[PDB]
Amino acid sequence: VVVKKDFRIDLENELFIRGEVTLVEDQIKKPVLVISHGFRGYKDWGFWPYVAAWFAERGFYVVHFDFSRVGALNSGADEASVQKLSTVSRELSDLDAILSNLREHRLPLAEQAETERISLLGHARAGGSNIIFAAEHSYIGSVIAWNGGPPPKPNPFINDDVEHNKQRFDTARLLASLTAPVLIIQGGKDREALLEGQQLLKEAAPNQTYISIPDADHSFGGEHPFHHTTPYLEEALEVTHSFITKHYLEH
């Protein structure tokens, strides 16, 4: 009943993105959820296959994908090559490619995607990058960060990138002004630096929604490999799904 369709977007040079559309086919347009994996992840990592299917069963047209850096590394690209593809800027560029292909209806089964109702879900570092993309694109109607969100902070490319985009990447400023519904879910058993940044977000932008799951770690327990769900991932899923469905279209 859940259909999974592979796609590949060939980018410039040898860069490419492998992704999946996950969907229960009902011949109607379904709200879109585009999922971004974290810095240590990939589309087949940990809970992502489960999460993609979970949302497809709940009525979403789901896209998840390997960032460019992942396809480069599996192609055996140089260490400098992979490092420069690892910037936040490159996430935003990859995400722009994913969303352009969705909006031009080039992804599989795109006739069943409601591009008028697009949401982002970002894990860890991609929680900050998804907030940035959301803030910069009117067609993103809501964004959810899992154990991420605060501004992105051995890679010299990441240093140059963070240095040249100190204002653009300030998710604290962006969240204070973004009128779209944003949800940040944070596990209590994550590193303190992150938890500190999450309080600064909540103080900067109280208008948004902040959910803490005290006993959950940085992955809600769903690190690789994934044999079963956990209470914490299940909560994050139900809260995220309630957030999108109950608030997306509200004024």
Author numbering: 5 to 157, 163 to 260
Reproduce passages from the article.
PsEst3, a psychrophilic esterase obtained from Paenibacillus sp. R4, which was isolated from the permafrost of Alaska, exhibits relatively high activity at low temperatures. Here, crystal structures of PsEst3 complexed with various ligands were generated and studied at atomic resolution, and biochemical studies were performed to analyze the structure–function relationship of PsEst3. The residues located in the active site, including the catalytic triad (Ser128, Asp199 and His227), were strictly conserved.
Four structures were obtained: a sulfate-bound form, the wild type bound to PMSF, a malonate-bound form of the S128A mutant and an apo form of the S128A mutant. The S128A and S128C variants were prepared to investigate whether PsEst3 exhibits the same mechanism as that of dienelactone hydrolase or a classical esterase. Mutational analysis revealed that the activities of both variants were <10% that of the wild type [Fig. 6(c)]. Structural superposition of the sulfate-bound structure and the malonate-bound structure of the S128A mutant with the apo structure of the S128A mutant revealed r.m.s.d.s of 0.4 and 0.3 Å, respectively, indicating that the overall conformational changes caused by the ligands were not critical.
